[PDB]
Design a protein around this ligand. Structure first.
Ligand SMILES: [Zn+2]
Length: 255
């Protein structure tokens, strides 16, 4: 599977039937239909003790991985119950500035989307969390092209070293707190992973406020390869999945 003409998201359902499921992501967020639920608690992002460990090009995106052996970087509160541990973050971007995000707001696509992935600790490990309806909490953050995001630059400079699929580089002491927008207002709805196995185990938390990055910054993402070293070069761009039917779901807004 991939994002090309013959192995794209429209073919996924053949190897993964859940792709036509009842709670697939991403979805379009209709700001006028989202329900303000005054019972949603604020979000608690505790990323101070975060231990980043490595950056890896997995052929579909680049993943920055964190040590999840203890409650170092967690997320709780909001619509969640229990403590969700951060395991990795990655992005989805376009070949152009008008597209790249997975979620969209009133049909507006963004230049890219940051997804911070966390698993419910009650389940012991990541492998077991994905098999539960409330196993994952994914924090989605929109990126628009404007002024540079200083905090993101350390990530941008290491990309040259993980150009092709299968490559990784040690990536310690990265502080993910520098990627958060100023506000923590969000929309939330029950959903799924956006790449195969496309499991419906995710509580999505999409932040209202996007962060800006510079054109020079996103352009660096576009120099990545889906291919492995020594294979024909295929640029890693447009690795995003299109919106899926909302169906029997309600999108709640914390504001
Ligand atoms: Zn993703």
């Amino acid at each position: 599977w991939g994002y090309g003409k013959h192995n794209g998201p429209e073919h996924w359902h053949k190897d993964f039937p859940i792709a036509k499921g009842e709670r697939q992501s991403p979805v379009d967020i209709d700001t006028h239909t989202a329900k303000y639920d005054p019972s949603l608690k604020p979000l608690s992002v505790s990323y101070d003790q975060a231990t980043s460990l490595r950056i890896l090009n997995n052929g579909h995106a680049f993943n920055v991985e964190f040590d999840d052996s203890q409650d170092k970087a967690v997320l709780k509160g909001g619509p969640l119950d229990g403590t969700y541990r951060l395991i990795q973050f990655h992005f989805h971007w376009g070949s152009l500035d008008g597209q790249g995000s997975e979620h969209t707001v009133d049909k507006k696509k963004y230049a890219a989307e940051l997804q911070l992935v966390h698993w419910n600790t009650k389940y012991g490990d990541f492998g077991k969390a994905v098999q539960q309806p409330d196993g994952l909490a994914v924090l989605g953050i929109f990126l628009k092209v404007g002024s540079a995001k200083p905090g993101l630059q350390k990530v941008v400079d290491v990309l040259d070293s993980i150009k092709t699929k299968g490559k990784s580089a040690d990536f310690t002491n990265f502080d993910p707190r520098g990627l958060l927008p100023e506000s923590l207002d969000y929309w939330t709805y029950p959903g799924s992973l956006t790449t195969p196995p496309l499991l419906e185990c995710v509580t999505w938390i999409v932040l209202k406020e996007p962060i800006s990055v510079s054109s020079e910054q996103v352009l660096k993402f576009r120099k990545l390869n889906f291919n492995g070293e020594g294979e024909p070069e295929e640029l890693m761009v447009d690795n995003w999945r299109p919106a899926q039917p909302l169906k029997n779901r309600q999108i709640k807004a914390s504001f």
